[model samples]
Target: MFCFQCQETAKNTGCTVKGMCGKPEETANLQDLLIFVLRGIAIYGEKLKELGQPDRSNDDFVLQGLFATITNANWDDARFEAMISEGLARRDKLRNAFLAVYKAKNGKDFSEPLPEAATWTGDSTAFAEKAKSVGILATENEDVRSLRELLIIGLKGVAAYAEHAAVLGFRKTEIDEFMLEALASTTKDLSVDEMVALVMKAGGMAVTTMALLDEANTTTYGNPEITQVNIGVGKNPGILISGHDLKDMAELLKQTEGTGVDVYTHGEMLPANYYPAFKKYPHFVGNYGGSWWQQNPEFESFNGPILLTTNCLVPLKKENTYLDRLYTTGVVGYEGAKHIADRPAGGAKDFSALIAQAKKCPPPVEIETGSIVGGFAHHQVLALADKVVEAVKSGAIKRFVVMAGCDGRQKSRSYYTEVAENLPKDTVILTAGCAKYRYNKLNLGDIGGIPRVLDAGQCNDSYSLAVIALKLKEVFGLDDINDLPVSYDIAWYEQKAVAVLLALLFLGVKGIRLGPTLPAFLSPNVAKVLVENFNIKPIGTVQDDIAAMMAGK
Candidate 1:
């Protein structure tokens, strides 16, 4: 039942009895078992490639399996059990395919003994016992375990991005191959150097996958534009769309149109308001709430069906009355919540059930009023490059602090808001992900018409932040990216943030201050390696960090 893959892990260590995110030990064990079986599938999938018989039939399934195990995503123990059962079938299929191809090529049966994960099988009743033997603690060496878990955690993020891009009909062969190879590597013995290299490789693929998603999103929905979204509610009953899936956003909008149902974005879906394509929805209201962790009250106040398009779903408490109005799709699940099936081969996902439900409910209570400006994704920001560059050269903008990553329920997260408020008015906050919920609406004054907080869409769009930084480096003619007046004060909550962190490191950015605390998955030795090689540090006092960042430290 041990797990420490997220920011709010118990006491900054592993969660053994229950998850801080409300995941029961039984569900956690099943997730671990599912991952174990996926590794078995990956081992055979990789071997098929080595034998020149690469079978990609199981690629999308692999992504879905990994994404399902991310924190706060799925809690239905039955779903994990089903996924594990399917994973075993896929592994055996790949093994059989590999065996057939190996015999034809080598004229002899393959003789290498497979890892236990490859051959292990268990019924649902035995899953708990089998998981005990194959859980994360199976690796005996602390340093090796740290490196392996780090890479696996980062791959969870990669799987998330890869799945998003895949849903939009975008796929990269290199990304797929890397995912399989990385998963397979975890099943076998590997040295620290090899593990670290695999982690870095995962980072590069993270970058590539994000780029693919960025392209898919912009090309399909039009580049995000600078826009102000209403925080006020409309008279019509609304369906609140949360999580980070734009495809679901588009489909739901289409299905709900003219049905007398208004739609609003919640949590990470706030960026959906900035896309030019969605702007045409006359009944589409605006953002209804803050980050993912605040949904308990926000969802209750909304008084309508809440559709979670991806992860970021919080488990409902018994007293919480929104479960009947909660609907999940695309790898997000809850036992009592209605699940929306996936879209068909070339058709939209039907949301008539939600639209109909919204019609009978009341409009959301006004949580807040006025608007917040966003849509500073790479294309939008690049359009304003001349203005941004002149401000930097003229000293109107002193530094760019990247306050991007996930936001959680912890009180320590107030450090982000304090840092945002305390930064000089001449500096701008470059943000993405839900962390922007901290101070995105703050009255941080602009630097000559440039808004202090430049949100480049969701955590998936963190790639936009990276693109913006590289462009700044080029514009300033700086050889080292660190030489630019930019600092990374990233606040991560889960694995997607881990992938973004590794991508930043792979891009040669250094001196990143990560908090509210470093991941517990990092062994002291691995943490030391990050600190010595990349200058990664934990967040300190707000004033000190602001001062250091302003000094380009």
Candidate 2:
């Protein structure tokens, strides 16, 4: 049970005997013993934040115990043994609320001596022999265990985008006190420039938890625009759904509308079909399948009940017949599927058992058809920023790229569909996750009217492609957002694309280029200090990375 955090693990290095995403090495040693009891409840919630008493009341159970240990989400080993006995009863109630505020602010009683990740205690039969001695090779220093497993895999993508802006009621509390001070600085022992300054303070808390989950999804589903979904299939009985929950795709499109079912939107819930509060729900049908590793033959020909409102769930294949029509909800779990249950206080989530198994199944057979244009997310590409800065000053959009992240089942991810099919049709392609399901239904047309792939919707909207590259670097008065013609060429597979590559190297964005490779938990002197401080590169021959991102290397 070694695990390499993700990006397919195994042959690329760790994953000791199973999990090339099918998980099971006893669910990767009970998700490394529930991240070693959520780093002892982030070391008594960072000593109750240095005893100023900062107990954020277990910040959504430490953001669902670090998003149910990320990679393919919860493989449900009794939900990581009931989140490691509820993270040791939230680390002994933050160690008796940091020993009653350290004996009422140092009045004495605190005989200090903690770290076994803040006094470890165990049961559940000593959690797989204490997760084989606190996993990730217990920091035997290989570049401080690659900057503490790259800041706990970018704080499990900043606790899965701050628990999707805290289930929509959006509370920041300094992104939950910087995710309990970077999960109590990975249970201490800092160095190598203080573990690369706690992974650049988790890249400024992954750009303030993806700009507070893009302002709690454009203030609860508004901003995303352009539209035109429908990858066909319809005839009543559908459900589909898929991960990256938009409040469980707006409460399963208001409890599956007039009931004959429908719903659709698979993988990353295909950006909940460009959200204008879910296109006034006319059964809300659109997107079924593609991405999240093609959901085992697209959730078995999409013929009904699918749900999975979070992490990509794929484990099941002994003559795979959609595990009782899969359901799962929130931090997604599996074991014999079904799940759902949440949203009750002032609530919705009773998806009526996935709308009664999508009314006895059928419908959704067609896997492809027409309409695909996305909403171009930074407020619909800054409302087309003056025809994209006059198609980049009349040269007719010479370059834009930024090819956002994640899309796996790697056939070398077709080098992002051959660098989006030989990038020189005057270059535009700005994309957001599910790696725009490789060349977004191709026909990569648009530059004058803008859509050359421009999709900015989920990998959690790559913060709308970094707010459309800082508004195209403030309308081209570019004082170096790497001088704006934009390049990036990314493609990652997990830990929310390492918190969107640590929020694009904390927004100073450099040479960039990552690939279908790179993170085998770094450590080659921390991948040569990210290729000598940020000119990080990797993917090569897609015609020499499209001639070094068209000469702007």
Candidate 3:
């Protein structure tokens, strides 16, 4: 089976018989032999860093083997055959420490070209018969398999934001040596303008792993504020928590605290209810389902236990009667679900079997609850930059859209809920991932106390919406955040929205407008060099991108 990497491929050009995200063809040939043994331990950790140092645990096992084969993260073919039998014994323990430091740094025993991800050892538990000559048709050029699958899906969203900033303990070492030289330059032989200049240095190393996962999530859960959550429903028995892990939702709210169990939050874990440390957990109940492909009837009208820690999981229907109250954890898995694991050497996550199965079920059936405001992350929109520059200097907030990314199962993603219900009622939709569940419950009301939709929380907090658009371009003095009034109508599907659209084209940020399409592995000359050096537009109707983003001014 082949794959196009995302935006629901297949008929649009790849996913050769399986995996519109069900991922089969024997789990996509054991995830393309675990990304060819993590690009052969990133070509033996970039040739044992030329016989010196730097193997910070092989950069967290080459970003946990490229976030365990992304697209809806893990599917559990025996946990990717124990992650390809532990990535072929850690790629032969970094190929015998890079040929004993290549015979002590060129002292006589090495040559280097060796690619088959470094001399293919072959049968790592018979990797589905050498994953049939390795993936994307082993790169026989079509624009170098669209710039090496856009630098390996933006290095699987920079190994899923460096594995959620190494689960809060955070680590960088120059973003782990540019993720081991961009996963060993995707096993070399590069040329199409050096694979389009390493896909613009993997989009400038996905803006330094989304600013090292927004400084490991606002210094471990503090910044995100501007509260107001409780999407109604209380009286116990909750535990929903969906993907995009906030340290597995703070270790399942510290093992479901005083046990009466509540903990709601779904789809990019709905800004974990405007986190002032998860609102000091009064049983942390708030946010249910929607987004992450709607969550099969919102995880079957939520009657307890549904935790999924990461990736947009969507494979259960057939009127999925609560497939055993679905529960997965970190690199999410499936196969008759129930996972949870992680949390031993620095312990906390014993979700008490999902808080003793959410006290034997039955509580969250009410899908549409009430108060749904959001956290406005980048230091709470730079502490409300003087009431959002006085509602855009008194026009009562005219424009600021960036409808962030990811939310599909496309019906043209309902034109992102009709361009946030036809914007311009004093524009202000600055959303974040799970593409604001297509119009975050479109109440679209507030303008005075400011809130026409300003979520700033996940999709790597859009790196706090690129630090709130460079502090709204230094509080409107503007040198060129494209002359402000923000617009970017984004909406991507996987690879963490292709590392947040290559960290918004490595932060030069421009007209940007992805959509329900663009990316059947690019290559219309790499999508015309991203629409002529990053003006990057794509989506169309929603009365024509809101009348061309409100006729530009």
Candidate with best TM-score = 1
TM-score of each: 0.99, 0.36, 0.36
Q: How many pairs in model 3 have backbone atoms within 3 A of each other, for residues 3 or more apart or on separate chains, i.e. clashes? A: 0
Largest lDDT belongs to which candidate? 1
**What are the per-residue Cα lDDT tens digits for candidate 3 across 406-517?**
8888687888888888787888888888888888887788899888888887888888888778987986788888878778888888887887888778777867888878
Which candidate would rank higher by lDDT, 1 or 3?
1
Q: Local distance difference test, per candidate?
A: 0.91, 0.83, 0.80
Residue 314 miss distance in model 1 (angstroms): 0.8
Q: Is candidate 2 or candidate 3 better by lDDT?
A: 2
Candidate 1 Cα outliers beyond 4 Å, as residue runs: none
TM-score of 1: 0.99
Q: Which digits, one per residue and each the tens of the lDDT, describe model 2 over residues 15-71?
A: 888887878778888888788778778777877777676778888988887888888
Which digits, one per residue and each the tens of the lDDT, describe model 1 over residues 167-209?
A: 9999998888888899899877878888999999998999998
